A paper describes a structure:
Barrier-to-autointegration factor (BAF), encoded by the BANF1 gene, is an abundant and ubiquitously expressed metazoan protein that has multiple functions during the cell cycle. Through its ability to cross-bridge two double-stranded DNA (dsDNA), it favours chromosome compaction, participates in post-mitotic nuclear envelope reassembly and is essential for the repair of large nuclear ruptures. Phosphorylation of BAF by the vaccinia-related kinase 1 (VRK1) is a key regulator of BAF localization and function. Here, we demonstrate that VRK1 successively phosphorylates BAF on Ser4 and Thr3.
We also verified that pBAF still interacts with the LEM domain of emerin. We observed by ITC that both BAF and pBAF bind with a Kd of about 1 μM to the purified LEM domain. We even obtained crystals of the complex between pBAF and EmN that diffracted at a resolution of 1.4 Å. Determination of the high-resolution structure of the complex confirmed that BAF and pBAF adopt similar 3D structures in the crystal. At this resolution, the two phosphorylated side-chains as well as the Lys72 side chain were unambiguously positioned, and a salt-bridge between the side chains of pThr3 and Lys72 was observed. On the emerin side, only the LEM domain is visible in the crystal, the disordered region of EmN being probably proteolyzed during crystallogenesis, as previously reported. The position of the LEM domain on pBAF is similar to that observed for the LEM domain on BAF, as illustrated in Figure 7B. Consistently, a salt-bridge is present between pThr3 and Lys72 side chains in the 3D structure of pBAF bound to the LEM domain of emerin. Determination of the high-resolution 3D structure of the complex between pBAF and the emerin LEM domain confirmed that BAF and pBAF bind similarly to this domain. At the opposite, its interface with emerin is distant from its phosphorylation sites and exhibits no chemical shift variation upon phosphorylation.
Author numbering:
A (entry chain A), C (entry chain B): 2 to 89
B (entry chain G): 3 to 44
The structure:
């Protein structure tokens, strides 16, 4: 479930976790993200940080570049925001 | 003029030339265009 | 004061530290990074992460963005790499 993926992602350092571990990143989004060079969850975290953790900027970027819908971009944004609040 | 290339097309050129790279995003576009230019002209 | 800056940088999560907290990022480099929009150390961490922790890409980007020489870029990279091995 989405809640379980979010809870598991924010619970611990991400290390070398694949991009698919991020809540909101299913098979389709994960494959598009991997095609763009976002193989690991940390690469997506990098873009979130370069965008200064801005929700509107990150969500617009994920929707336009990877084909994410509003729900998926919110779930992925939320997992990264809460992970950074806990560990960064 | 690499501006006509999409991020996907820029990524494809970096891969074709075996130039190590990560994602093409707003903060890396200038770097990868410079690297492509230097590799093509030198 | 590079070794002191490196030790303090890699010891804890970076939170809201400015870019000048990074080993190698002195007054000239820090001011230039902030003028380019890399206003916090986490923004530079973000760039290191979107560059897949690649030393050559990171050091080339830093030289082009802030005018870092080889030594400054080697030190900034090392501090981010050791931090990411510990906390990311």
């Amino acid at each position: 479930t989405t809640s379980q993926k979010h809870r598991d992602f924010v619970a611990e350092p991400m290390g070398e976790k694949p991009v698919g571990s991020l809540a909101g990143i299913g098979e389709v989004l994960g494959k598009k993200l991997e095609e763009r060079g976002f193989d690991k969850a940390y690469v997506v975290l990098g873009q979130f940080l370069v965008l200064k953790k801005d929700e509107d900027l990150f969500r617009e970027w994920l929707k336009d570049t990877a084909g994410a819908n509003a729900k998926q971009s919110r779930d992925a944004f939320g997992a990264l925001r809460e992970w950074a609040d806990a560990f960064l | 003029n690499y501006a006509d290339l999409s991020d996907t097309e820029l990524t494809t050129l970096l891969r074709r030339y075996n130039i190590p790279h990560g994602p093409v995003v707003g903060s890396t576009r200038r770097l990868y265009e410079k690297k492509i230019f230097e590799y093509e002209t030198q």
